[PDB]
Amino acid sequence: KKAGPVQVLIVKDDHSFELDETALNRILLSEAVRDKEVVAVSVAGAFRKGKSFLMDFMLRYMYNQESVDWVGDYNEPLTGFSWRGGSERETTGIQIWSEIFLINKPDGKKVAVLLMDTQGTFDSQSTLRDSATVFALSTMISSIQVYNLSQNVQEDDLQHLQLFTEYGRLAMEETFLKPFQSLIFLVRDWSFPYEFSYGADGGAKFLEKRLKVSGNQHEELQNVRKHIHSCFTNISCFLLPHPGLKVATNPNFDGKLKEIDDEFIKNLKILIPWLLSPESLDIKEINGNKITCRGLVEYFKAYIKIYQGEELPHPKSMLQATAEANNLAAVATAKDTYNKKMEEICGGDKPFLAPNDLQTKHLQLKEESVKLFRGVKKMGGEEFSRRYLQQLESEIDELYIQYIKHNDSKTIFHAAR
Amino acid sequence: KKAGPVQVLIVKDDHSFELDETALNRILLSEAVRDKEVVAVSVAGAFRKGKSFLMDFMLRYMYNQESVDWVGDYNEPLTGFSWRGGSERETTGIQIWSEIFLINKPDGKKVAVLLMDTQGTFDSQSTLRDSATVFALSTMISSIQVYNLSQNVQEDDLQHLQLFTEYGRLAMEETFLKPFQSLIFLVRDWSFPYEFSYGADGGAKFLEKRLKVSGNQHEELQNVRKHIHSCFTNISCFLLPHPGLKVATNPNFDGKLKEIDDEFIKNLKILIPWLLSPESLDIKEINGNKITCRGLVEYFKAYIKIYQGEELPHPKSMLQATAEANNLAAVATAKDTYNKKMEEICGGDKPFLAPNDLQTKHLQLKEESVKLFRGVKKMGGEEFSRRYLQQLESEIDELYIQYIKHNDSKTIFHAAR
Numbered sequence: 001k002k003a004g005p006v007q008v009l010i011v012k013d014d015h016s017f018e019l020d021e022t023a024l025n026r027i028l029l030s031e032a033v034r035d036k037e038v039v040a041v042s043v044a045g046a047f048r049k050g051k052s053f054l055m056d057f058m059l060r061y062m063y064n065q066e067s068v069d070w071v072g073d074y075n076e077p078l079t080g081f082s083w084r085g086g087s088e089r090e091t092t093g094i095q096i097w098s099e100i101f102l103i104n105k106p107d108g109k110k111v112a113v114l115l116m117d118t119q120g121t122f123d124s125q126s127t128l129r130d131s132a133t134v135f136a137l138s139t140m141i142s143s144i145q146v147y148n149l150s151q152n153v154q155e156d157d158l159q160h161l162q163l164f165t166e167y168g169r170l171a172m173e174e175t176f177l178k179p180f181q182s183l184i185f186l187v188r189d190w191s192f193p194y195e196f197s198y199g200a201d202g203g204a205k206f207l208e209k210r211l212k213v214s215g216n217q218h219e220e221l222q223n224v225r226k227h228i229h230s231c232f233t234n235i236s237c238f239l240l241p242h243p244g245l246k247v248a249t250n251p252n253f254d255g256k257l258k259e260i261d262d263e264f265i266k267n268l269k270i271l272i273p274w275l276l277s278p279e280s281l282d283i284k285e286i287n288g289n290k291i292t293c294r295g296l297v298e299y300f301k302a303y304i305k306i307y308q309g310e311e312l313p314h315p316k317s318m319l320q321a322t323a324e325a326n327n328l329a330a331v332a333t334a335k336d337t338y339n340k341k342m343e344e345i346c347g348g349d350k351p352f353l354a355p356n357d358l359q360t361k362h363l364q365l366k367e368e369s370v371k372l373f374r375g376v377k378k379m380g381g382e383e384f385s386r387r388y389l390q391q392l393e394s395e396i397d398e399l400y401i402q403y404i405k406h407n408d409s410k411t412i413f414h415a416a417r
Numbered sequence: 418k419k420a421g422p423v424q425v426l427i428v429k430d431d432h433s434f435e436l437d438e439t440a441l442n443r444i445l446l447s448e449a450v451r452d453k454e455v456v457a458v459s460v461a462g463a464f465r466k467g468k469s470f471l472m473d474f475m476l477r478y479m480y481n482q483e484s485v486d487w488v489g490d491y492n493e494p495l496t497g498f499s500w501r502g503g504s505e506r507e508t509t510g511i512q513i514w515s516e517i518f519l520i521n522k523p524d525g526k527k528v529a530v531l532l533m534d535t536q537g538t539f540d541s542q543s544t545l546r547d548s549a550t551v552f553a554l555s556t557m558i559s560s561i562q563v564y565n566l567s568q569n570v571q572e573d574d575l576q577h578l579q580l581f582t583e584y585g586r587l588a589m590e591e592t593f594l595k596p597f598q599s600l601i602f603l604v605r606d607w608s609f610p611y612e613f614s615y616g617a618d619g620g621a622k623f624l625e626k627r628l629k630v631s632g633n634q635h636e637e638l639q640n641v642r643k644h645i646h647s648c649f650t651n652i653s654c655f656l657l658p659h660p661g662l663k664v665a666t667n668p669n670f671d672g673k674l675k676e677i678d679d680e681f682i683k684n685l686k687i688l689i690p691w692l693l694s695p696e697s698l699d700i701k702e703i704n705g706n707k708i709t710c711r712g713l714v715e716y717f718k719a720y721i722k723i724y725q726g727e728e729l730p731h732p733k734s735m736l737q738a739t740a741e742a743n744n745l746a747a748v749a750t751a752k753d754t755y756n757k758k759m760e761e762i763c764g765g766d767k768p769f770l771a772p773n774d775l776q777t778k779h780l781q782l783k784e785e786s787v788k789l790f791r792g793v794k795k796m797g798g799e800e801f802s803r804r805y806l807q808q809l810e811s812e813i814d815e816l817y818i819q820y821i822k823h824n825d826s827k828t829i830f831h832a833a834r
């Protein structure tokens with residue numbers, strides 16, 4: 001048929017995930033490609049940043065690799081994966097190109113090349129779990145992940161990457177090898193060529209400075225960086241110029257090269273082959289073993305099941321995760337404080353205490369623990385704390401009841417007039 | 418001679434905070450302004466996005482408000498707060514303009530106007546606590562907070578804003594009133610005037626869609642929005658055009674209007690008075706009471722002390738907070754499970770168990786609890802879990818010791834040949 005985009009991972013309105021297995025099998029399990037070792041290319045990152053648009057230039061290269069003018073006719077619209085302006089997301093879930101490219105590597109290996117376009121993270125219809133699942137799955141599956149960013153590499157960008165890739169790691173078999181392979185920090189609309197040049201060399205210098213870990217660097221800064229180094233075998237950076245305001249703002253813009261700034265085009269022609277030339281095609285490795293298209297379908301199915309289940313922790317926002325953490329820790333301290341004090345009163349090495357006195361002491365101790373809990377400043381504040389405080393009181397009462405039984409076993413009664 | 422930027426909040430290299438009290442007092446405690454009700458304007462948001470640049474135009478408006486041509490001579494460079502290109506942060510901590518502007522409000526009140534320029538969030542030398550502190554403090558002190566965004570309002574931006582404002586709330590007196598007043602979402606380089614027009618009306622429609630809370634919207638989406646509605650009295654949005662590639666890109670660019678796109682200038686001229694015209698100047702209110710410059714210095718000192726201490730919870734990244742949350746919860750379940758099983762064996766209502774048998778049962782139960790803990794998938798893995806597992810085992814052992822004493826108190830010994 002006509003080659004086209006195929007929706008492979010579907011994100012439902014209830015935030016669940018479906019894999020189109022029939023469609024996936026039709027593409028990767030064909031007699032022509034199934035036994036071929038696979039190269040998987042993905043682009044991922046914040047929504048509305050020209051991921052699909054870039055991927056469509058990648059397509060022109062994959063088809064027209066032989067011509068020096070692979071970049072295309074200057075009056076020809078850009079087609080393939082769906083891309084457009086407007087502030088609302090276009091690409092959802094994960095889609096792959098229906099035509100698998102067969103390329104000869106400089107070592108004589110004929111390999112299969114798969115292209116993946118992904119739903120941008122942090123759009124306004126998505127839970128953090130949605131964004132994390134999409135990003136993770138694309139990372140786990142691709143051998144080359146193009147991490148698409150706007151203008152700069154900010155600390156929050158590194159943190160998002162850490163979280164999303166951590167979510168991918170959780171769903172994977174444990175290994176001594178790094179989980180993933182090639183990672184590319186593609187910086188769109190890089191504005192400072194006078195400081196770091198456009199392209200890969202300026203990019204590399206820019207990334208080495210930004211990902212640098214040093215002795216006097218605060219641990220929080222060190223850790224997010226070390227995490228990224230530990231995840232990927234090869235990490236690079238490419239600085240791309242702004243493509244011009246027509247591309248950005250013009251509702252009629254169709255993707256014709258005649259409308260794009262020449263400096264952008266010059267760098268794009270460097271970028272794509274740098275990604276996709278035969279010598280650059282990273283064959284997918286899982287657990288240090290090269291994977292075929294057939295094998296990739298089997299891992300895709302297995303990973304998706306894990307994300308469909310409930311074994312993994314839910315990805316959470318900073319506020320939500322910190323508030324929970326603050327409350328859980330405070331409950332533990334408060335309860336433990338109660339336990340220690342009751343031990344001094346009716347531990348096994350302590351005498352029988354009259355039940356009315358034991359009750360008075362318990363009410364006092366419980367109250368001290370509640371005040372202790374109330375007094376700790378936590379995010380989410382008191383409202384968020386409510387179920388935790390009630391949990392604290394409910395758990396202290398369970399302990400008290402256990403203590404009542406211990407104390408009663410020492411009961412002394414003397415009859416006296 | 419005279420006026421210039423003054424560093425008021427200093428962030429040290431060890432990530433501690435110092436207030437320049439002498440400098441603050443010299444400006445806000447002067448006889449001319451100390452007893453005046455105060456309007457405090459702040460710009461805050463991601464680093465390297467033109468906050469200081471914008472603020473310098475605010476300065477032009479503040480000085481030249483009377484002239485219709487306040488925006489300035491087209492050949493005049495932009496000065497005041499320090500602004501520049503390059504990928505490394507410029508503004509650190511918080512600085513204020515040395516000259517407090519005295520303006521008559523249309524109701525006859527003469528008020529004092531203060532401008533605050535802030536260190537951008539998420540730079541590569543800052544902990545999350547550094548950024549949260551800067552953002553929170555600027556929000557707590559300002560009556561008008563300009564939230565500076567690039568291109569769009571993404572879900573992560575709303576999450577950052579929720580966290581930072583929560584960090585501010587934690588340091589403030591309990592109140593029934595909303596903690597803050599005016600918040601402005603200023604979107605720089607808005608790319609879709611064909612969808613939502615440049616300026617406040619387009620901004621307003623875009624923001625009402627983006628901050629909208631509905632019945633069928635996932636709770637995670639609802640909650641970050643409700644939090645924002647709850648924090649601020651008046652929330653608005655302004656969509657600003659790209660100022661042109663020269664402004665973004667030219668190392669020689671000086672802030673001269675002749676180098677700036679006319680549509681940007683057209684919109685800038687609307688934006689500033691919309692923020693700062695006499696009718697718009699929001700008097701700072703804390704706990705529903707209007708504040709003078711004298712009072713503002715006092716709240717500034719009081720809030721900063723809280724951030725210098727350790728009563729507040731530490732802001733943490735998604736991974737760090739979620740990983741801690743996962744581990745704390747798993748320890749409580751695992752420990753609670755051990756406790757319940759031991760109760761069935763040596764609760765107060767249970768007969769004496771020979772210590773060798775009690776020991777065997779304890780080792781079995783502890784082991785079941787450890788496996789339960791190890792079986793729960795957590796961010797990020799065993800590495801992060803190590804201290805928690807050790808805490809779990811160590812806490813179970815404490816419990817066991819309490820049970821040994823309970824059991825010994827029921828000891829039965831019979832002498833027999």
Ligand SMILES: Nc1nc2c(ncn2[C@@H]2O[C@H](COP(=O)(O)OP(=O)(O)O)[C@@H](O)[C@H]2O)c(=O)[nH]1
Nearest residue numbers: 047048049050051052053083084085188247248
């Ligand atoms: N500012 C800017 N806009 C771009 C660039 N590349 C593409 N665009 C525009 O970005 C918008 C969104 O493109 P799209 O590929 O659908 O974004 P996606 O959501 O990441 O897949 C379109 O209007 C493109 O014309 C770029 O490098 N810089």
Ligand SMILES: Nc1nc2c(ncn2[C@@H]2O[C@H](COP(=O)(O)OP(=O)(O)O)[C@@H](O)[C@H]2O)c(=O)[nH]1
Nearest residue numbers: 464465466467468469470500501502605664665
């Ligand atoms: N793309 C873009 N660049 C801007 C805008 N305003 C200022 N700039 C440029 O942004 C850079 C950083 O300016 P600065 O005010 O120091 O950023 P800040 O660190 O957020 O305070 C300078 O190169 C300005 O020329 C804008 O609206 N859009």
Ligand code: ALF
Nearest residue numbers: 047048090091120
């Ligand atoms: F906003 Al998108 F693909 F990330 F349309």
Ligand code: ALF
Nearest residue numbers: 464465507508537
């Ligand atoms: F990067 Al800035 F003020 F945010 F210099």
Ligand SMILES: [Mg+2]
Nearest residue numbers: 051052090091
């Ligand atoms: Mg897309």
Ligand SMILES: [Mg+2]
Nearest residue numbers: 468469507508
């Ligand atoms: Mg600045």
